[PDB]
Write a protein that binds this ligand. Structure first.
Ligand SMILES: [Mg+2]
Ligand SMILES: [Mg+2]
Ligand SMILES: [Mg+2]
Ligand SMILES: [Mg+2]
Ligand SMILES: [Mg+2]
Ligand SMILES: [Mg+2]
Ligand SMILES: [Mg+2]
Ligand SMILES: [Mg+2]
Ligand SMILES: [Mg+2]
Ligand SMILES: [Mg+2]
Ligand SMILES: [Mg+2]
Ligand SMILES: [Mg+2]
Ligand SMILES: [Mg+2]
Ligand SMILES: [Mg+2]
Ligand SMILES: [Mg+2]
Ligand SMILES: [Mg+2]
Ligand SMILES: [Mg+2]
Ligand SMILES: [Zn+2]
Lengths: 208, 124, 138, 83, 104, 71
RNA sequence: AGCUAGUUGGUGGGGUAAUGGCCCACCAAGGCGACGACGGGUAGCCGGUCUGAGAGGAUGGCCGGCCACAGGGGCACUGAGACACGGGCCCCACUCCUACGGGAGGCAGCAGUUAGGAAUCUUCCGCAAUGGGCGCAAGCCUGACGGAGCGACGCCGCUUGGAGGAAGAAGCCCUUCGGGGUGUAAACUCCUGAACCCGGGACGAAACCCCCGACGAGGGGACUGACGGUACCGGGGUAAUAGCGCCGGCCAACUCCGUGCCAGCAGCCGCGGUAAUACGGAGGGCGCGAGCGUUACCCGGAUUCACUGGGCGUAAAGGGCGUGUAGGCGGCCUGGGGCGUCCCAUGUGAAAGACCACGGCUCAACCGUGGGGGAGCGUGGGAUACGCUCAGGCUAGACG
């Protein structure tokens, strides 16, 4: 199952900052805060010019490590965006952004992607009523994504939806902080997402 | 060739030739040791590679290499051949699976243990 | 004998243009003239006219070229960068209207010979027909 | 004897029959002469039974002999209703 | 439709039967050049009628003998050994290439 | 690791086979194919067909041995 | 490289449901072959499948279609249908019974045993559902089938937690001994709550049948589940498996120690003979993750059998030269044909799979519905530039 293990080491290896923790990842502590270098005994040594491979490999590892997903799933998702019409780079991101666990996270129900996964797993989530605990469930346009009434009293869900007061939401979303609901309006576009990723590379990496 | 020639004689499909008559094109084949000698490397290498003549159940009797720090292979010791040449030992086209049959796995292995049939070292 | 007239012509043209001849002769034949017609139309040659060389009928094929160039080798760019027989005796090539190739992403053309005359590929496609794939040119 | 019966096309614990016209001797899931309907025993969708009654009536017009169940489903879509 | 064919009667040596040499043409599947292949059919000619050299239409028929499922439907054009020639000579070359050889 | 069932017994060069190869007859019992040790070959040290020499023998194959001590 | 005597054809007859040398008598001397006969080898064929940019290559398990077989060989009987896997006879082999005369068998059906092998499952449940045979029916039979079982064998889904948490414990590794790394990782706080306990508990099953109605249409009634007390629902509820390969280059990942051309690695190039990022361990790292790696085989890379798409002066590759058979190829003009070739319509191209859409199971895997594509071939109609054909003409090739 999903990665599970020191996560900020990925943050560091990937150079770029990844928000795999929500809070703190904002506090002067995501370590990328004074330690933007890779983990291990060689972190600080000079970097030799990366190979065409390296680059593509890293770019993929990045994007994927973001949504915290098994290469298995990641790949198939990719191969799917590939067949579907439309610029693959986009389509793909749109699909990653359609995972239920992602939306729960993109809706402030959860502090991080990991956490949202657990909320989905422990059934604290709703999809047009019926609860869905499949973190890889494809949320699609029109789908309302509530929170377990039963769970609506959970401190976590409260604190989370609390700070959510004020915070805006993605233009392909919309959430009603009152009834702890939110609608998936449309598949976010490449422009809509601001991922530190060059998907042209990720495409090329699966070219090889 | 001219097109007409092609039509007449046409192209000849290439025939691949197996490099492992582990007969019945099996993935592995088990046999019995005849001799557990030692052989010297080739052209620019030196050492005493551990080898073994094997009577296969496939009927064939071939020379297999023994991978690892040290074996416990004798004579009538049943073993499993797996195919894999060894650039230094011509006439040696297969390796001997270690950890199968009479081929005890490598003792004190901590790395690529799987390729040496040695269980997980119970770390305390 | 002159094994393949249509090739013989494209080649003469190819050869002449390669050394920048202005005009160039080729033993005339209705079929040959027909092809040149397209050649002229598509603007690959200035055009052509029926002449009489040593008493026998030929076809002057007025070649065309890009302008003079800069630096080393001021030789003009070709107008006919390519031109190749496709259907050849002892290896005829026929295509269905759905199997008509698109020469050089459309920048080039292919000349088919159909029961509806010798049209180019757009002409053939438009007229919904196929035929012998005489040659591509770009 | 040509018949009108069901052909199992579902999947484990997910049966989905095909009201078919086939000679009586073929595997129940073998080559049939013609499909003429389908049936979702569990009604897992609003539409869980259709029958080209035009067609049924035809086959019956010629010796087609329906399974008791095949006849059931048929009837249930006025295949015989002669009002 | 009962397949109808055309060919030359290269053999007249039988009783109530003729050998029609049907020539076929078609593009080679991989090299595409059109190639001319062919085959002999033993057509049924009850009245002896058709003689060596004729071009006849052959018509798919009910078995008449083993190795014989065609009847001469009609004569297309009489006499023309120029075709029987090709055949005969081709056979004659055979009468060589093996241990000795055949005159050119 | 490197087991320790090696030995250092001595013997005398018998044959002068090809490619630094010898018949070396062990003072002990018989003779073995004996090849010239890398070290020794790197430091040259030609080896005549009749010298007292030291051999490294793996029980694995007594039939073979490496010449260690030059003379 | 030549094959052939029932062999090729004919006349008459037998035979079958039926055509036929299928069989027979008589007659003729034919039939096949380099466009590859005959012989040898290998092999069930296909829808498809795998790979591939494609062309193509490879393949034909599971599913559907066809064929062949039922210990090996031959033969018929009964029948609508068999030359008849759980029918018959004979011969052979093998096995078992035998009062030695003579008898009985055939799992390539389900499960299971044994043998061979690197290797392949339960002598399960059920007839409730679908389907099949017989029966007026009730119903009986159904190892077909529907299910459960075992095996990461494959595919998909899921868990081993989430959030906070030091300029950063200890231990272990490295150090230019200042320190650097494992690392927010841990400890710890708080949050959720797989397993697991309790309660409820299913679709799949409505017919056959019975009653009214005419044993019709139509209407009412009754019986019936292996799976299964499983799916799922609700309540309670524990922080609760991680491994494997790799880090010289191809190729993402580097250091210390040990060893000293040894022990060993190895796919190829190669590495090891005292500073080894290539052996062995450790720290650290890279990649995947209930998998990971190996071996085997197929496609790929390989335009390295080149149709797409390769070549032959010296790299592999021009035949010692000619004459010439078959075959391949064929100048200019015109006319007929319309074989190739092109077009249109139409039939076929089963289902499944592939593609698209929507839908069902919390998703997906899986499955249902609908739609589109599809070479090839059949039929009809059309075109005629090119190729073919036929006819006529010509002199620019050729010959004289
Ligand atoms: Mg050692
Ligand atoms: Mg076979
Ligand atoms: Mg390719
Ligand atoms: Mg009978
Ligand atoms: Mg049986
Ligand atoms: Mg039943
Ligand atoms: Mg029944
Ligand atoms: Mg690297
Ligand atoms: Mg060292
Ligand atoms: Mg190739
Ligand atoms: Mg080629
Ligand atoms: Mg080459
Ligand atoms: Mg040469
Ligand atoms: Mg020469
Ligand atoms: Mg011509
Ligand atoms: Mg035509
Ligand atoms: Mg759905
Ligand atoms: Zn971070």
């Amino acid at each position: 199952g999903r990665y599970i293990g020191p996560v900020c080491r990925l943050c560091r290896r990937e150079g770029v900052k990844l928000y795999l923790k929500g809070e703190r990842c904002y506090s002067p502590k995501c370590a990328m805060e004074r330690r933007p270098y890779p983990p291990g005994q060689h972190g600080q040594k000079r970097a030799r010019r990366p190979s065409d491979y390296a680059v593509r490999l890293r770019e993929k590892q990045k994007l994927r490590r973001i949504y915290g997903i098994s290469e298995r799933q990641f790949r198939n998702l990719f191969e799917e965006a590939s067949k579907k019409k439309g610029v693959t780079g986009s389509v793909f991101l749109g699909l990653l952004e359609s995972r239920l666990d992602n939306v729960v996270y993109r809706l402030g129900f959860a502090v991080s992607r990991r956490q949202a996964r657990q909320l989905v797993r422990h059934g604290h989530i709703t999809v047009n009523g019926r609860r869905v605990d499949l973190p890889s469930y494809r949320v699609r346009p029109g789908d309302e994504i509530a929170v377990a009434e039963k769970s609506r009293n959970l401190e976590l869900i409260r604190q989370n939806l609390e700070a959510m007061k004020g915070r805006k939401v993605g233009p392909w979303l919309s959430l009603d902080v009152e009834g702890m609901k939110g609608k998936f309006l449309r598949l976010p576009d490449r422009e809509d997402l601001a991922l530190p990723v060059q998907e042209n590379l990720v495409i090329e990496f699966y070219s090889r | 060739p001219t097109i007409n020639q092609l039509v007449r004689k046409g192209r000849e499909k290439v025939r691949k030739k197996s490099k492992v008559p582990a007969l019945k094109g099996a993935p592995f084949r088990r046999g019995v040791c005849t001799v557990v000698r030692t052989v010297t490397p080739k052209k620019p290498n030196s050492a005493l590679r551990k080898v073994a003549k094997v009577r296969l159940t496939s009927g064939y009797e071939v020379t297999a290499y023994i991978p690892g720090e040290g074996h416990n292979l004798q004579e009538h010791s049943v073993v499993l051949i797996r195919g894999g040449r060894v650039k230094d030992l011509p006439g040696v086209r297969y390796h001997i699976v270690r950890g199968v049959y009479d081929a005890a796995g490598v003792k004190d292995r901590k790395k690529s243990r799987s390729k040496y049939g040695t269980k997980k070292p119970k770390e305390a | 004998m002159l094994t393949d007239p249509i090739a013989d012509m494209l080649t003469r043209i190819r050869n002449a243009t390669r050394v920048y001849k202005e005009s160039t002769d080729v033993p005339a034949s209705r079929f040959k003239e027909e092809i040149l017609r397209i050649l002229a139309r598509e603007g690959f040659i200035k055009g052509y006219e029926r002449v009489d060389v040593d008493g026998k009928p030929y076809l002057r094929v007025y070649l065309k070229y890009g302008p003079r160039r800069q630096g080393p080798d001021p030789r003009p760019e070709q107008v006919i960068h390519h031109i190749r027989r496709i259907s050849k005796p002892g290896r005829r090539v026929y295509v269905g209207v759905k199997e008509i190739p698109r020469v050089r992403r459309g920048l080039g053309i292919a000349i088919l010979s159909t029961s509806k005359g010798v049209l180019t590929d757009r002409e053939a496609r438009k007229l919904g027909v196929g035929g012998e794939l005489i040659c591509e040119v770009w | 004897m040509v018949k009108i019966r069901l052909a199992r096309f579902g999947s484990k614990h997910n049966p989905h029959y095909r009201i078919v016209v086939t000679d009586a001797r073929r595997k129940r899931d073998g080559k049939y002469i013609e499909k003429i309907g389908y049936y979702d025993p569990r009604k897992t969708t609003p539409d869980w039974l259709k029958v080209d009654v035009e067609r049924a009536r035809y086959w019956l017009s010629v010796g087609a002999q329906p399974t008791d169940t095949a006849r059931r489903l048929l009837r249930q879509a006025g295949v015989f209703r002669q009002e | 439709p009962k397949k109808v064919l055309t060919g030359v009667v290269v053999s007249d040596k039988m009783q109530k039967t003729v050998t029609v040499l049907v020539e076929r043409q078609f593009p080679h599947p991989l090299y595409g050049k059109v190639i001319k292949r062919s085959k002999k059919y033993l057509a049924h000619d009850p009245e002896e009628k058709y003689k060596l050299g004729d071009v006849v239409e052959i018509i798919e028929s009910r078995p008449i003998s083993k190795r014989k499922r065609f009847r001469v439907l009609r004569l297309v054009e009489s006499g023309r050994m120029d075709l029987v020639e090709k055949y005969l000579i081709r056979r004659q070359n055979y009468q060589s290439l093996s241990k000795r050889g055949g005159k050119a | 690791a490197k087991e320790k069932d090696t030995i250092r017994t001595e013997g005398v060069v018998t044959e002068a086979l090809p490619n630094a190869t010898f018949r070396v007859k062990l003072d002990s019992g018989p003779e073995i194919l004996a090849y010239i040790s890398g070290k020794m070959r790197m430091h040259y040290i030609r080896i005549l067909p009749g010298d007292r020499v030291v051999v490294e023998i793996t029980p694995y194959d007594p039939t073979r041995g490496r010449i260690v001590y030059r003379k």
